Amino acid sequence: SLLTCGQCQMNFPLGDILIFIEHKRKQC
């Protein structure tokens, strides 16, 4: 289970889609 941001390559477990989506609200 994993998700990785495109510009900065940060880790987020798949069951944490809300966390990941909150990371792409803020800029990186």
Residue 28 binding partner per list Zn ion, its own copies, none, with a CB distance cut-off of 5 to 8 Å that depends on partner kind: Zn ion
Q: Which residues of 1-28 are buried (b: 16+ CB within 10 A; e: fewer)?
A: eebeeeeeeeebeeeeeeebeebeeeee
Q: How far is the CB of 28 from its own copies (least distance, A)?
A: 11
Strand, coil or helix: what is 11? strand
**Mask for 1-28, x = binds Zn ion (CB under 5 A):** ----x-xx-x-----------------x
Q: Which residues bind Zn ion (CB under 5 A)?
A: 5, 7-8, 10, 28
